Structure formats: C-alpha cells, structure tokens
C-alpha cells in the first residue's frame, strides 16, 4: 500500500514539525515504513536553483508562479512520489497552499491561474493531511485579559496571506487540521498527538 502525504503550513511551526516527524517515525517503524521529511522551496537541487533565481532575477508575477510550480513538479517526480510509491510517508514543510497564500493572497495572483497550475502539476492529487499553524490576531487562552489593538503594506500583505490560507483550509474540509499556534505548547502537542493517533 502507498504511503500518505502530510504537509505543514503557516506564516510563522518548525519546532512542532521536527517533534511530529519523530513521533511519526516511531509509529511507522513497526509497520516497516519510513518518513521522508522535506520542504518547499528547496526540496530538490533544481528547486534550490529556482529559488535563487526567484530571489535574484526580477520578472513578471506569472513567470514567478510558473517557476514555483516547476519546482513543485520536480519535487513530486524526484522525492514525494517515489517515497509514496514504495510505502514511505512524506512530510513537507510547505506545499501548494503556501503558493496560494503568498502569491494569491499576498501578491494578487488570480485564484483561477493558481488552480490551473495546481491541477496541471498534481492532477487530482492532494495531501492526505495538511496541518495549518494559524497565527490569529488574538489569544483565545487570554482573550478577556489581553487584546491586540485592531494597516501598513506589510501588515496588509500578512493579513491577506493569513486569510487565503484560511480560505484554502475551509474549502478542503477532508484535508485540514487547523492549529491555533498562540495556544500553550502542551495544548498544541495534545492536539498533534490526537492527529497522530488518527492517521
């Protein structure tokens, strides 16, 4: 049987990813399987190269999107799909949701252009699970005692990016687990233990 593909998303995440992967390998080891941990951008040597071009060569926003999805296509061909095919599970730090969030929400790339490239690269393939570490403007475990006062361009960009991640999450109810990353570590870890027990 094929492995499962899990992605981690969010603006902020790293701490919890390493821990989650250690727990997952502990669960997969008995079943004779392994976790391949990876990331985007830079999930392949080609992806590293395209990332450097994106950092260094100004270009049209649509051109940037094509290069991102090129990197993703190679990430699938070289790392993810071979792992899943041999029964290994994959955990990626970011995937297509991140492209929607930052390029669509943040930078204004139209949703239909983004969905067209997602379909081109993935067909109907989606991650089996996406854990989104949301960074909300208030803390629910302190709401009556702490209030962030209710934007500049940088603020507006991050607000749109957050909002697009949440839109993607709401649209994909069978795929997403939203974690409120403002909660105590022990609460986040209990929620993630529940995910691990459910996989």
């Amino acid at each position: 049987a094929r492995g499962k593909f899990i992605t981690f998303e969010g603006i902020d995440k790293t701490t919890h990813l390493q821990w989650f992967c250690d727990r997952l390998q502990e669960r997969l080891g008995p079943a004779g399987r392994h976790v391949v941990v990876t990331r985007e951008p830079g999930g392949t040597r080609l992806g590293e190269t395209l990332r450097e071009i994106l950092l260094n060569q100004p270009m049209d926003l649509e051109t940037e999107a094509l290069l991102m999805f090129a990197g993703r296509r190679e990430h699938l061909a070289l790392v993810i799909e071979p792992a899943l095919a041999r029964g290994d599970w994959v955990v990626s730090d970011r995937f297509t949701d991140a492209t929607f969030a930052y390029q669509g929400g943040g930078r204004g790339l139209p949703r239909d252009k983004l969905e067209a490239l997602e379909r081109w690269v993935q067909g109907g393939f989606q991650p089996d699970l996406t854990v989104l570490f949301d960074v909300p403007p208030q803390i629910a475990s302190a709401r009556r005692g702490a209030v962030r006062m209710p934007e500049s361009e940088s603020d507006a960009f991050f607000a749109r990016t957050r909002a697009e991640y949440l839109r993607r999450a709401q649209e994909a109810p069978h795929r997403f687990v939203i974690v409120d990353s403002s909660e105590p570590i022990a609460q986040i870890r209990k929620q993630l233990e529940g995910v691990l027990a459910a996989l």
Side-chain angles (χ1 to χ4, degrees), residues 1-11 13 16-17 19-142 145-150 152 154-189 191-199:
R2 291 169 55 88
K4 291 206 196 147
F5 179 34
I6 301 165
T7 66
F8 271 52
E9 289 291 2
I11 292 167
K13 155 64 143 36
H16 300 296
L17 174 60
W19 176 89
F20 181 92
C21 290
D22 290 340
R23 300 296 78 68
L24 183 54
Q25 184 54 53
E26 290 171 356
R27 289 170 176 274
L28 298 172
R33 293 161 190 273
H34 291 267
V35 187
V36 174
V37 188
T38 190
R39 69 192 180 188
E40 297 187 352
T44 64
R45 190 199 299 118
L46 177 61
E48 292 179 313
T49 307
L50 298 176
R51 175 189 167 272
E52 314 202 30
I53 295 167
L54 282 171
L55 287 168
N56 289 285
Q57 168 76 82
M59 64 182 78
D60 191 272
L61 187 58
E62 289 190 358
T63 311
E64 296 189 43
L66 287 165
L67 295 186
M68 300 172 180
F69 278 89
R72 185 160 300 121
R73 186 65 189 87
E74 194 60 23
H75 198 207
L76 288 159
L78 191 61
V79 176
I80 300 163
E81 176 54 32
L84 297 177
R86 77 184 169 256
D88 286 338
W89 287 37
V90 175
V91 177
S92 189
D93 187 354
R94 301 186 190 283
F95 197 61
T96 291
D97 297 307
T99 312
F100 277 74
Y102 289 88
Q103 305 313 308
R107 300 178 75 201
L109 197 60
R111 183 178 310 159
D112 63 342
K113 308 289 291 213
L114 287 155
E115 291 182 344
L117 293 189
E118 174 179 33
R119 278 196 302 280
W120 199 97
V121 169
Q122 295 168 219
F125 179 70
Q126 284 295 343
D128 297 289
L129 167 67
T130 301
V131 186
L132 173 60
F133 289 79
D134 183 35
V135 187
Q138 311 291 345
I139 304 133
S141 53
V147 185
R148 192 167 174 268
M149 293 179 70
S152 63
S154 192
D155 213 30
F157 175 98
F158 284 112
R160 289 194 302 276
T161 299
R162 168 167 186 258
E164 174 63 9
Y165 265 138
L166 292 176
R167 188 195 67 77
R168 289 278 294 177
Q170 197 200 296
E171 165 181 85
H174 301 291
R175 176 158 76 81
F176 275 81
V177 172
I178 302 171
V179 179
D180 182 337
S181 66
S182 75
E183 295 162 343
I185 289 156
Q187 186 40 56
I188 292 175
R189 295 284 176 72
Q191 180 178 9
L192 292 179
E193 288 173 358
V195 171
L196 288 156
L199 279 170

